[PDB]
Amino acid sequence: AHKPVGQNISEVRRNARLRRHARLRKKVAGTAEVPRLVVNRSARHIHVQLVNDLNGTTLAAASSIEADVRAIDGDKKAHSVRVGQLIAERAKAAGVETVVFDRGGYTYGGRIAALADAAREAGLKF
Amino acid sequence: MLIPRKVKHRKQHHPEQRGIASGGTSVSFGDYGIQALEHAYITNRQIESARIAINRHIKRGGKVWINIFPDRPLTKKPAETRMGSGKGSPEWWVANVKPGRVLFELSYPDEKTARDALTRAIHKLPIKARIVTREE
Amino acid sequence: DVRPKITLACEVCKHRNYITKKNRRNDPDRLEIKKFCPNCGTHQPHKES
Amino acid sequence: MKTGIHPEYVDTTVQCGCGHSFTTRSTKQSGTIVVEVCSQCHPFYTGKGRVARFEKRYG
Amino acid sequence: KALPRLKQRYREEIREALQQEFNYANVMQIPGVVKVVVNMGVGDAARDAKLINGAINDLALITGQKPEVRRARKSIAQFKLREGMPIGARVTLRGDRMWEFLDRLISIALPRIRDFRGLSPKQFDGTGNYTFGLNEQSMFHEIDVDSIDRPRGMDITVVTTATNDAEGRALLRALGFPFKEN
Amino acid sequence: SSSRNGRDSAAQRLGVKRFGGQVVKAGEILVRQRGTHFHPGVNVGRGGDDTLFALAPGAVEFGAKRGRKTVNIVPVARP
Amino acid sequence: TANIPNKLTANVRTRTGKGASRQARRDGKVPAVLYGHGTDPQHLELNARDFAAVLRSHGTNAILTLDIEGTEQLALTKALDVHPIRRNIQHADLLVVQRGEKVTVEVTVLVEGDATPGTLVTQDANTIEIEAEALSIPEQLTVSVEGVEAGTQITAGQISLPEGVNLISDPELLVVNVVEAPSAEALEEEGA
RNA sequence: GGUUCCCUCAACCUGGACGGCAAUCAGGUGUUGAGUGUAAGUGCACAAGGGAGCUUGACUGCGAGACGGACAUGUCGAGCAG
Ligand SMILES: [Zn+2]
């Protein structure tokens, strides 16, 4: 019988991110007029959503799991630009033109900053 | 004489003398006990006089329990002074007793000497009281 | 007085725009700080008299 | 590793009195060091001039 | 390209050595070494500033990186200690730089101790970590004995993934720590 | 001898000014307090000295969110 | 151990409250409640003198068979409300039980015998918990202090329980603590 | 003081050169018992508590709507522009 003594770094990392995501969400919130752009990052992919916090409903969502994004022959940040452009097309196809950015806890920079600037040049303003 | 080591507040209002006792109305340790039938403030001087009276009757054997403690101070202002200028310094410690409370207990092998011993203690207290046992 | 009252003046128009306090033991020198000067109309360096 | 806050650190080479040699990295600017006791020399690992002075003049 | 000798030795001579001895279910349960931390509690730095300055000078030579200067987190009158002033130093080592230090500590410094009699195996930290101290600091070849002022020992501690002390000893003796027979 | 006591300070008239269901204007004071015994809710702000005031006209409504007592302002529908 | 249920006549109350319960007591009755796995509490009334006679001769854990408007019902006495001063029985809880059901019950332990003449007996715990059948609850539990010398902690795990009765309280309670009898100098110093 | 970002204490158990109950180091338990310049109370772990970077809003012209009130005083405030 094996009995681990402490906490794996995965558990420490996970609870620390949710800790600093809630500290973020004490200010930003989603409304139908000005939705919220939630981004989730992993070691393989990146996800975005447009959430309306008034009733807890998701408007549009783009992700790196889509077949067309996988075909890109760049690095991880090259797929983040592709994912950012998809959400901007889907955001404006539902009448949304202004959003607020929810970085999800992660540091703003690198992959996250690549996605946001891809969705800024594509029409969304935030 | 029983005296608390320290009390947080030295000069306190008078304990209220309304209602009947909520807890302590039964015998837990000994075989016989003294149950109160009136409200009063039982001073530590009366408690000491009332458990010595129990001691002098059972002599050697047996055990005595005291279920109340003089926690609450009563102040007296200095003699032959006019009213005013503060509140007096505490003098004697009392225990707020309500009807139904069990004050003393005793555990002695025979009954007559134990019931006689508790009666000597009742005559030292400023209240009506009775002897109770552990049975319903 | 340890904490006396000091007047900060613009370094361009020499107008006495603010008054505050400082500890003249922790800050033996004249306090240098930027504050809005209404006469100039922009944030300018203000130095203690 | 920050740039200009750490001691200068270069690969070295240790040579012992038993002929053993390693290939390690340390802080010594020389590039090599020589030691007379190693893992192969000290008695506690192996289990095997004052000594020579009494063993030469007196026997 | 290449690896430190201990990491090379640990990778495919030590890892599977523990496999049959303890009969693990996953390779993820094989213990390793996490980090090594070198400490010097100066203590008497409350009296002079030169004391703390000397310790951080030597500790860079021993390991190969700049140390911290651990400040006191409490004011103690009995020790003439006021919170907020240097009291010690600390260096942690990870990755390659850890393995060389473990290489040199066993090979060179440890046998250089006068009348060396190994290290006690009972100093384990309950859950599989080992710590030990030195009364001096001259057992390192990266210092010059002439320049040495006073003894200033360390507190070497080795952090492992082993669950218990039984598995903690097994990993450390494989590296080559000279445990006494007791 | 004498008494060393006898001091006190002016009562500050703290408390809930507008109660549940009571229609208020914008900027109107709802609760005067020291700490956040009551936290602000929707359309309610907190002042410099921890005063809760309405940010929009409506009706007062007390609630509870994540273990915290809150004060909320709900709109009144025009006829 | 087997018991015979005690017959009692229970009348369903019409009005409940503090005013109605006080009036019922003045007429020589005790309000009572019949809950349990019936899961529909009945607010009953019992004759005050007849109910207390059953308690006198059978103890607090008395099995009862009640007559509610012509229908019988096995009931157990769960708790009693007693005035501290008047020693009344102001209320009573009745728990519905069926034959073969196991219920956890507190029974009294009695001390008997005559120990060493130089010792004093001090019983610490008045009751211990058991778990017996509906009709197989002992009416008392007996312990013996005979020839017991000096300090002995008689323990709750050393009480001779009948068959089919399992101790529920932990087996390390101190029930009877025989001790050397206090002397005239031990009396004086204790309590000052 | 302003803002942006990061963090979780006290106590207890175990192992360590001087070193001891208590200095610095390591692992575990630990949901607030620590801390908040300063009395007490109401609060604060979502931190208002600990750490770091830049900084002067410790502004100018104003201020719908309110609290409290013998009067004179006193207090809160969204929002507009520079
Ligand atoms: Zn100017």
From Swiss-Prot, chain B:
<comment type="subunit">
    <text>Part of the 50S ribosomal subunit.</text>
</comment>
<keyword id="KW-0689">Ribosomal protein</keyword>
<keyword id="KW-0820">tRNA-binding</keyword>
<dbReference type="Pfam" id="PF00252">
    <property type="entry name" value="Ribosomal_L16"/>
</dbReference>
<dbReference type="InterPro" id="IPR000114">
    <property type="entry name" value="Ribosomal_uL16_bact-type"/>
</dbReference>
<dbReference type="GO" id="GO:0019843">
    <property type="term" value="F:rRNA binding"/>
</dbReference>
<dbReference type="GO" id="GO:0000049">
    <property type="term" value="F:tRNA binding"/>
</dbReference>
<comment type="function">
    <text>Binds 23S rRNA and is also seen to make contacts with the A and possibly P site tRNAs.</text>
</comment>
<keyword id="KW-0694">RNA-binding</keyword>
<feature type="region of interest" description="Disordered">
    <location>
        <begin position="1"/>
        <end position="24"/>
    </location>
</feature>
<dbReference type="InterPro" id="IPR020798">
    <property type="entry name" value="Ribosomal_uL16_CS"/>
</dbReference>
<keyword id="KW-0699">rRNA-binding</keyword>
UniProtKB/Swiss-Prot annotation, chain C:
<keyword id="KW-0687">Ribonucleoprotein</keyword>
<dbReference type="GO" id="GO:0005840">
    <property type="term" value="C:ribosome"/>
</dbReference>
<dbReference type="GO" id="GO:0003735">
    <property type="term" value="F:structural constituent of ribosome"/>
</dbReference>
<dbReference type="InterPro" id="IPR038584">
    <property type="entry name" value="Ribosomal_bL33_sf"/>
</dbReference>
<dbReference type="InterPro" id="IPR018264">
    <property type="entry name" value="Ribosomal_bL33_CS"/>
</dbReference>
<protein>
    <recommendedName>
        <fullName>Large ribosomal subunit protein bL33A</fullName>
    </recommendedName>
</protein>
<comment type="similarity">
    <text>Belongs to the bacterial ribosomal protein bL33 family.</text>
</comment>
<dbReference type="GO" id="GO:0005737">
    <property type="term" value="C:cytoplasm"/>
</dbReference>
<dbReference type="InterPro" id="IPR001705">
    <property type="entry name" value="Ribosomal_bL33"/>
</dbReference>
<dbReference type="GO" id="GO:1990904">
    <property type="term" value="C:ribonucleoprotein complex"/>
</dbReference>
<keyword id="KW-0689">Ribosomal protein</keyword>
<dbReference type="InterPro" id="IPR011332">
    <property type="entry name" value="Ribosomal_zn-bd"/>
</dbReference>
From Swiss-Prot, chain D:
<protein>
    <recommendedName>
        <fullName>Large ribosomal subunit protein bL31</fullName>
    </recommendedName>
</protein>
<dbReference type="InterPro" id="IPR002150">
    <property type="entry name" value="Ribosomal_bL31"/>
</dbReference>
<dbReference type="InterPro" id="IPR042105">
    <property type="entry name" value="Ribosomal_bL31_sf"/>
</dbReference>
<dbReference type="InterPro" id="IPR027491">
    <property type="entry name" value="Ribosomal_bL31_A"/>
</dbReference>
<feature type="binding site">
    <location>
        <position position="38"/>
    </location>
    <ligand>
        <name>Zn(2+)</name>
    </ligand>
</feature>
<dbReference type="GO" id="GO:0006412">
    <property type="term" value="P:translation"/>
</dbReference>
<dbReference type="GO" id="GO:0046872">
    <property type="term" value="F:metal ion binding"/>
</dbReference>
<keyword id="KW-0694">RNA-binding</keyword>
<keyword id="KW-0689">Ribosomal protein</keyword>
<dbReference type="GO" id="GO:1990904">
    <property type="term" value="C:ribonucleoprotein complex"/>
</dbReference>
<comment type="subunit">
    <text>Part of the 50S ribosomal subunit.</text>
</comment>
<keyword id="KW-0862">Zinc</keyword>
From Swiss-Prot, chain F:
<dbReference type="InterPro" id="IPR018261">
    <property type="entry name" value="Ribosomal_bL27_CS"/>
</dbReference>
<keyword id="KW-0687">Ribonucleoprotein</keyword>
<dbReference type="GO" id="GO:0006412">
    <property type="term" value="P:translation"/>
</dbReference>
<dbReference type="GO" id="GO:0003735">
    <property type="term" value="F:structural constituent of ribosome"/>
</dbReference>
<protein>
    <recommendedName>
        <fullName>Large ribosomal subunit protein bL27</fullName>
    </recommendedName>
</protein>
<comment type="similarity">
    <text>Belongs to the bacterial ribosomal protein bL27 family.</text>
</comment>
<dbReference type="Pfam" id="PF01016">
    <property type="entry name" value="Ribosomal_L27"/>
</dbReference>
<dbReference type="InterPro" id="IPR001684">
    <property type="entry name" value="Ribosomal_bL27"/>
</dbReference>
<dbReference type="GO" id="GO:0022625">
    <property type="term" value="C:cytosolic large ribosomal subunit"/>
</dbReference>
<keyword id="KW-0689">Ribosomal protein</keyword>
